[PDB]
Amino acid sequence: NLLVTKRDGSTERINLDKIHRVLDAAAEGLHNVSISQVELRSHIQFYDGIKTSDIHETIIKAAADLISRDAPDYQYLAARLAIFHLRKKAYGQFEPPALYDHVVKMVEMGKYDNHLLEDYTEEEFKQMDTFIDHDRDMTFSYAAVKQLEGKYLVQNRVTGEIYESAQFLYILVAACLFSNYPRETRLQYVKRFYDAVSTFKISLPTPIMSGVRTPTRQFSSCVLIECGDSLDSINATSSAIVKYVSQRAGIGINAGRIRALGSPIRGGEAFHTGCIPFYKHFQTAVKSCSQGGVRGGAATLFYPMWHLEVESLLVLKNNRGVEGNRVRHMDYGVQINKLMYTRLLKGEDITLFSPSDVPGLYDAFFADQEEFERLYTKYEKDDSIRKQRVKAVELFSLMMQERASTGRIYIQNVDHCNTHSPFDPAIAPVRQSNLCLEIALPTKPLNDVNDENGEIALCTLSAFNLGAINNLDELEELAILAVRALDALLDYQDYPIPAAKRGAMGRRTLGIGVINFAYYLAKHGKRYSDGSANNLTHKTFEAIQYYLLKASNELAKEQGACPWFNETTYAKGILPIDTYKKDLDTIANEPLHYDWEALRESIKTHGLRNSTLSALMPSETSSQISNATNGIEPPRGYVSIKASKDGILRQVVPDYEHLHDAYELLWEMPGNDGYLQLVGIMQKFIDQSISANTNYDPSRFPSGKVPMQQLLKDLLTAYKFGVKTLYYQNTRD
Amino acid sequence: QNLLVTKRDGSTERINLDKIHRVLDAAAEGLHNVSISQVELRSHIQFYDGIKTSDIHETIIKAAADLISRDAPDYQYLAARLAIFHLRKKAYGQFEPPALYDHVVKMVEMGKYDNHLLEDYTEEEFKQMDTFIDHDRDMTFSYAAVKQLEGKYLVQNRVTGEIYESAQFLYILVAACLFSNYPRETRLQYVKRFYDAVSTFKISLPTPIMSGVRTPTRQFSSCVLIECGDSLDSINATSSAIVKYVSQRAGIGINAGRIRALGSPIRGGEAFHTGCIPFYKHFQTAVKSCSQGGVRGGAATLFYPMWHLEVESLLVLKNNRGVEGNRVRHMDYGVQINKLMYTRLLKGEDITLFSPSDVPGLYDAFFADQEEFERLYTKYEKDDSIRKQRVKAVELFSLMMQERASTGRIYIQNVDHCNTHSPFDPAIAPVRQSNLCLEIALPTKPLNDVNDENGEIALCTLSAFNLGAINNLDELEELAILAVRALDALLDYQDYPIPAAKRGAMGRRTLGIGVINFAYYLAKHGKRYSDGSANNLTHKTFEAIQYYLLKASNELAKEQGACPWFNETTYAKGILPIDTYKKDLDTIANEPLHYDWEALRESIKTHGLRNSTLSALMPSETSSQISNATNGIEPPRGYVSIKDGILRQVVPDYEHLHDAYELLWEMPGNDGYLQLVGIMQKFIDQSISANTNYDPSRFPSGKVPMQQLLKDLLTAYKFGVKTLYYQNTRD
Ligand SMILES: Nc1ncnc2c1ncn2[C@@H]1O[C@H](COP(=O)(O)OP(=O)(O)OP(=O)(O)O)[C@@H](O)[C@H]1O
Ligand SMILES: Nc1ncnc2c1ncn2[C@@H]1O[C@H](COP(=O)(O)OP(=O)(O)OP(=O)(O)O)[C@@H](O)[C@H]1O
Ligand SMILES: Nc1ncnc2c1ncn2[C@@H]1O[C@H](COP(=O)(O)OP(=O)(O)OP(=O)(O)O)[C@@H](O)[C@H]1O
Ligand SMILES: Nc1ncnc2c1ncn2[C@@H]1O[C@H](COP(=O)(O)OP(=O)(O)OP(=O)(O)O)[C@@H](O)[C@H]1O
Ligand SMILES: Nc1ncnc2c1ncn2[C@@H]1O[C@H](COP(=O)(O)OP(=O)(O)OP(=O)(O)O)[C@@H](O)[C@H]1O
Ligand SMILES: Nc1ncnc2c1ncn2[C@@H]1O[C@H](COP(=O)(O)OP(=O)(O)OP(=O)(O)O)[C@@H](O)[C@H]1O
Ligand SMILES: Nc1ccn([C@@H]2O[C@H](COP(=O)(O)OP(=O)(O)O)[C@@H](O)[C@H]2O)c(=O)n1
Ligand SMILES: Nc1ccn([C@@H]2O[C@H](COP(=O)(O)OP(=O)(O)O)[C@@H](O)[C@H]2O)c(=O)n1
Ligand SMILES: [Mg+2]
Ligand SMILES: [Mg+2]
Ligand SMILES: [Mg+2]
Ligand SMILES: [Mg+2]
């Protein structure tokens, strides 16, 4: 005699057969799943007059809780049930409308960009509708669908109303990005690109997934802003942060130029009150807005190791201090070079300077290591220059201690970023990184928010799904599609800050990485830790960079090289294979299989459409769409528990049934050596950097505490193999 | 063995107590009831072998300063002169200052003085200005004055600590700079007259003028008012202007009430608005990012309407019982209230809260049109389609007064009073905010960029009349001419880092001239604050002040032209403050107008005013110490006030007036004080930094009841009080 409340507000007798019908449809083709089990977990929570939507959410939750090693197919059962509900939420029915009718209505509501109706005819929308396979929504895993409804699908962030479905997302991303292409080839690209992303061969980032089709055009994930030593630059930097955080971007801030506490201002008219009060101002700029209504804003701030306030800056995330000297809600990257490590190894002292007191030292730190060492030792001997001496061991230990405590103190090897780089340090040095330490681009400080002479670096991302290819030669066509889409995006999107448009239009920097690398190694029967994957990694990432360059080179023939191509090492006929750190020759003997010399000349002759092409991002969120292992990281477990706005999610490794023994889980590794070696080998070909993690299990160490010696050893090992940056440090609980 | 001292050059010589004694005799000349032996004994015991001669001098300064008392007040002059002696050595290497011209040349060469001085004046003119100077006026400072001189005002290295000048050089060059664009026929006559006025303490100058005017950095406006719009572009523009102006000696008043509430849709729902508090935090770090020109810390007051949707969250931002996520403690706040809000309180009704983005026209009418506000308010209160929240008026007001009592830093602005009794036409240029210390009330316009030419930032330049230095009220005629001319010339002389600020300054040319030594003034007339015995005297006094201020600015309009936007003032329509004051004042004062305001009215309507505003009563907490004045209109805490460390300051003429003063905690309540404020406000163009005071021990169970807090609040409104500054609670 129990009643349920329908969508129209009316009530009718409960019908358990209707629910069974829906469960049957979602369980089609699945193995080792039980409808009864979901029913048992669901029926008990029903009550008189329960809303029909609350019933649907109950059975989704019930199926999601049953995701396990014994029955992994619950990941599709839970996903499909969620898909069913999302259809009702968006369309009021299961079957999606015609694409054209959908677009017209959505443009009328102001949810889609007007250009869609201007750039495509009704005939073309009907033709694009034939490209769409809505049954591909039944190929998602549960974690994927939660990211879709939570972040990616176009929706009202106040109401919660869903406006679209996954395949409309995919086709309109493709339609918008190729909207400026000639009608002779346009739809052919739209279809090819739609297939590539909807069948998970190419992975798209969050701001593209949630942005490309909306009236707000900003799809770059990474924004790099260099701050100058003036109030005008600090104000400009702060404004650019607020504007770009609110428009879907994560921020990298370089504030190393700012003079130290106690420095004179205007000849001594003022006493400099320090960097920390300005860091706080950058922090509130980041936390002032949400990231385009999708997630919270975040930033990583960079400063040199030899900065005079470095001992104060290193403990900014430490919870044991007053608010006066704590800036906890930002991450930090300490910038290091060969000389600093040398002082550590020789057990010597490091001299701290304010960049305002040492002419030329800051610039040489990134561009010229010989000049740096000349100026550094010269200023160390100058009594007239304000300075402070610290033991290198104590300084490094403090850094690694804070890195261990928080996990969010990062390292950037600035010499590696410039000796092995797509840029000439004498023309455009790399002086910072981004939020997740995989981006390395040239920048220039601003004197105003609208300063035409400043440069903010933008990087637009994507990733190759290494688990979705049978041969490395598939990367060629995939690279062409990826490069063309991201490069066309640069002309398509808008730029709230003029200095950012400068860097984007001048360099056209792309950052394309990989996902499902752990799955990839598992299929080849290799491991992270023992070194069995060294040569396979070398072979694999050679193919990736080669086809990326080849695609960008061909696109230069068609549309012209980027305006500032002559500032690259590529322009001088220098390739990544020429400048890598030679210690890599001791850990890999895989030969080059592709014709780089023919490629070298073609680049030297026609140039590149893009100054950078590769960067290995963590893909923490975006990789969940294809149920991939994120980036290059090994999974935590066969069934991982990840975070979400709704609650906890269970995510299964791809093909657990056949590869349960093939995977090497994160905490099954003896140490970081094997991992750091793979990262170094990757870096040989990667244009920018890699979001490299370090991992430590306290229980594997005596007295349950990781010795400082081990931390410093892995740090030096990373530098030895040319690793440019270090991201998270994970400490097991 | 013999005890040695270390000289300045690093050498040593046998200690000579006679040298110290001789220095003490020079500083004690003409003083009474002081003992050199007392100072020497306290100093000698702290001496040690090889003691630096400069540490010797600092010791005898401390010794004299510790003997400052009611019994022997002249130690305040003993300690000061000793401090002046030492400051001479630091700046010149000797007691006697160099010739003015040689000093200026060297300081310009060192980059400590502005280049224009050597361009605008000849060597002959500097030698002539040197004849105006009386360096012996340095011996007329009190100790607190000299501590502010060496600490904040004298040109010095903020990293080194090196002093570069003395007080009379400060005074002569402030005058020389401000009148530097004057015709040579009258220029040096203005320089001498103005130098005499400030060095003999007739006119009091504010901190950024005292520490700024002669330096290469030209920004001397004390108050900067920035209105923020509901957009990121405006928020970014506001943040930039704050950082720039704090760094250049200014205090900030922020209007952030237009910002839509937490939960509001953005771009039709593309985003969820995360609230005002994260932006308030961004403003706080902007204020605290810089020092104020190297002199003191940055500070700001932020303003919002009482009917804002987040008002309950905004009111507790200084409350120390919360996580950092919803606490912005290092800023002050001004709650904006009007008649309709008070009515709901008195009637025991509800107040409806809105986000200004959801109530078209309500925010503007809140300041400009009380009739239209009530129409829109009641209309929107019944609209179900409009997001809203209802709160009992009693509970909302109690929360506000609770946080005001706990912190002392939650302020009140009666926005209707600020626009019905104003030099500005609310239909053209409404007053929508105040400043840091709640005495400034000027028009603003939000910016869309830091370089936006269509925005308006309000700047106010300050000064004060020393009421304890005048013999008759007609001496204000001369002093007003000097004060107005100096501040008006300053506007063309100084620079403007933000274009929107230059717009308001050049367009309205708003000045804020107040008073100091008011407590000393009442004491000389045998009046008190509390009983109402000074109501008519206050009326008579502040009538003369505003009249002579308007008259000075009216004459200045004839000579140089009225301000560009004079047409936006009530003065332009022939309306005077004596026409628009709150009528309840007629019940607490029957003093007639002694000056010809009708003749002035005709003159203003014809020739205009050089300045849109002229009067504002600032607290003058720092600047008043220079003349050893009682600060502003506030009564002293004691005969010896304790304000490097601790300072002792004696009220002027303690010997003859110890019985005439009425100390702060000798008062029954705030009624007598609030009536004086209301009477003052009748003539004041802008507002007054009005304090409320409470002694818990006078109340049952040692706690001031909310009913009493609300009574004083309503009393202030009753008498047309525009703003409320500090609430002081006795310990
Ligand atoms: N009478 C019912 N008794 C039990 N479950 C029901 C009943 N009607 C619908 N459900 C279940 O509720 C869930 C949500 O279905 P649905 O979104 O179609 O709700 P609805 O009220 O039927 O909507 P509409 O009337 O627009 O079709 C489904 O799992 C469906 O099987
Ligand atoms: N052909 C289908 N294949 C898969 N899922 C479907 C199909 N048709 C409908 N669904 C989904 O199943 C759920 C229930 O659909 P539907 O409203 O038709 O049934 P019901 O609500 O149980 O019954 P009714 O609403 O007619 O009382 C919805 O979430 C809908 O999107
Ligand atoms: N009042 C202040 N308080 C604290 N820091 C300040 C202040 N003014 C400027 N700074 C800092 O001093 C540095 C220089 O400031 P800025 O360049 O804008 O002024 P400037 O006139 O060029 O002086 P300088 O010639 O010394 O550089 C910057 O790091 C800025 O943040
Ligand atoms: N991502 C964001 N997170 C939080 N607050 C935001 C964000 N973007 C904008 N805001 C706030 O929303 C308000 C409106 O923003 P703004 O005017 O700059 O953008 P807009 O495109 O004009 O949007 P709208 O048309 O809704 O006004 C401002 O108060 C601003 O601070
Ligand atoms: N030999 C001394 N013994 C004791 N007190 C002294 C001696 N010389 C100076 N003083 C006192 O020290 C204080 C500081 O005086 P002053 O600045 O002139 O020091 P100084 O070393 O004598 O400098 P300078 O050489 O420039 O005259 C004064 O009170 C002075 O009387
Ligand atoms: N004529 C004066 N009137 C008042 N104070 C003076 C006079 N001459 C000097 N002083 C002050 O007295 C202090 C001491 O002056 P001065 O250096 O000449 O004497 P001293 O330090 O005691 O002895 P010494 O000759 O060893 O320096 C200084 O602070 C100086 O400014
Ligand atoms: N929570 C996050 C995650 C990523 N990012 C940005 O996205 C870049 C790559 O991160 P990612 O590949 O994990 O991001 P997703 O696109 O996978 O969400 C980083 O450099 C950040 O700039 C961010 O701003 N905020
Ligand atoms: N600590 C202070 C005090 C005052 N002020 C500014 O000075 C104005 C009047 O204060 P005041 O007259 O007490 O300042 P002084 O000139 O006496 O130092 C206020 O409106 C503030 O804008 C400031 O910026 N910082
Ligand atoms: Mg139904
Ligand atoms: Mg500078
Ligand atoms: Mg001496
Ligand atoms: Mg807007």
Numbering used by the authors:
A (entry chain B): 4 to 736
B (entry chain A): 3 to 645, 649 to 736
Question: What text comes from the article?
Answer:
Class Ia ribonucleotide reductases (RNRs) are allosterically regulated by ATP and dATP to maintain the appropriate deoxyribonucleotide levels inside the cell for DNA biosynthesis and repair. The α2 subunit houses the active site and the allosteric sites, and the β2 subunit houses the di-iron-tyrosyl radical cofactor.3−6 On every round of turnover, these subunits come together to form an active α2β2 complex, which allows for the transfer of the radical species from β to α, affording ribonucleoside diphosphate reduction. Excess dATP inhibits RNR through the creation of an α–β interface that restricts the ability of β2 to obtain a position that is capable of radical transfer. ATP breaks the α–β interface, freeing β2 and restoring enzyme activity.
We reasoned that substitutions of either F87 or W28 with Ala would create room for ATP binding in site 2 regardless of the position of H59 and thus be independent of the presence of ATP in site 1. We also confirmed that W28A substitution does not alter ATP binding in site 2 by determining a crystal structure of W28A α2 with ATP as the only effector at 2.6-Å resolution. We find that the W28A substitution results in a more open pocket for ATP binding at site 2, but no structural perturbations in the bound ATP molecule are apparent. All site 1 residues and site 2 residues F87 and F97 adopt analogous positions to those found in wild-type α2-(ATP)2. Therefore, the W28A substitution appears successful in uncoupling nucleotide binding in site 2 from the identity of the nucleotide in site 1 without substantially altering ATP binding to site 2. Although not the focus of this report, the W28A α2-(ATP)2/CDP structure at 2.6-Å resolution also provides a higher-resolution picture of the active site bound to the CDP/ATP substrate/effector pair. The hydrogen-bonding pattern that affords substrate specificity is the same as that described previously.
